[model samples]
Target: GLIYAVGGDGHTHLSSVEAYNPETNEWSPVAPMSVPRSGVGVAVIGGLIYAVGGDGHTHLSSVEAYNPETNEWSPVAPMSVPRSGVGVAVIGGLIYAVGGDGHTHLSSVEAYNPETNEWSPVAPMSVPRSGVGVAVIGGLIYAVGGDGHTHLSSVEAYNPETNEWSPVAPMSVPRSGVGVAVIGGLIYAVGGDGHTHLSSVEAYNPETNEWSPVAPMSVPRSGVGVAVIGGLIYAVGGDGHTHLSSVEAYNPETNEWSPVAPMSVPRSGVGVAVI
Candidate 1:
């Protein structure tokens, strides 16, 4: 399995893509996105990884799909809205793009059907959220904390069967640009910004409708990208004071975080996926 980090910023918006191999704790360059992007959203469906809307000098509605086998990226049907700091997740073979900011925070939601190669609007969220963290567990999609008028500690869940969204237990603290991942049926909300960059970590149990503190990253991070592979959760690049190349992995059993190989380029607002 390989963990891929898509376009993000070091100092400028980037088009670069890199893949990390856990087996060797190394990262290698791969094909870049067609255009530079930062604050991008990424999701994998059928063997293809799709890089969703993000900033490219201006907010973008354009999307790109990458084929790891061919080491190439190709254009895909674009979304109706230009979104940066968007949240994306796959449910029932469709990719759902949640709230993000274009010129302002958005509550709009849309889903892309890979089979039809098209996008269609779904239910919008209850309120606007930008830089939100989204994850799917047991078929329901959960959209975590992000900025609305202020940094938000609120959370919501989307049901595909009914095509509606409902409020869920909020996180303990307001956070935008949070990193989120699911493992062993539990959702972990990693580092993010509240008013400042944070190093705190929290875990949510759907059954309990609550969140609890967990071991935090070694350093504060915001705009981070997170993904799960095997039993380990990898926290990828984001801003920690400045953009970071540092990587860390968390072990649920031990409740600890450990250093891992860094990426070649420092990146904040990078999109991540595992394959």
Candidate 2:
């Protein structure tokens, strides 16, 4: 699998895309998006990368799909409402777009079916959130830290089986602009804004229903993007006092982080997906 860093801010909003090659330990540009985007949500399904809503002139409802083989991008069905800083994940062949800012915070959730090329409302999260980190484990969707009224530490898990959301253990501190990825059945919540940018990370074990501190990144990052490939969790570009193109990888076995090849350009509020 390849890790693709989607649209984000490089001082100004960007439509540029880059992919990290694990084999070469390098980052290279791919086809750019049709419109500049920051705070985008991305996921992969059926071998195609889907770039969801993000800030584009205004919060955007537009969506696009990229075919790696063709190295091309095309418009897809738009979401019902614009969502910037949205959280997105995939399970059961459907892509779920969770809470985000539509000028104001939102608690709405919707599911997209590629086959049908349509989005339908699903159960919404109990509280509005933007910049949330979302991932799936054991068929349930977990919505992690983000902003509600202020930076939030709250976390919620949605059970597709019951069409309901239930609160779970919260993080030790409030965070917005977080990133999440699952490995070894544990969900790792990566760095984000918490009054100030944070380099700290924690692992949530669903079996234990708890969060445990893990190795921290070398630099503080907010609006970071994370993805797991080749058994390593890669933390990509974000704002760290300045917009950054630096990258880091976590080895769960050692509970440590090590620098990896950086992106060609800086990006904050970027989205990431593995394909």
Question: What C-alpha lDDT values do all the predictions have?
Answer: 0.93, 0.93
* C-alpha-based local distance difference test score of model 2: 0.93
Which residue runs does candidate 1 get wrong by more than 4 Å? none
Candidate 2, 1-275: lDDT as tens digits:
78999989986899999999999998889999999989999999998999999998999999999999999999999998999999999999999999999979999999999999999999989899999999999999999988999999999999877989999999988889999999999999999999899999999999989999999998998999999998899999988979999999999999889999999999999999998
lDDT for model 1 comes to 0.93
- At residue 67, candidate 2 shows an lDDT of 98
TM-score of 2: 0.99
- TM-score for each model: 0.99, 0.99
**Tens digit of per-residue lDDT, candidate 1, span 161-207:** 99999999999999999999999889999998997898999999999
Model 2 lDDT-worst window of ten: 2-11
What residue pairs are clashing in model 2? none
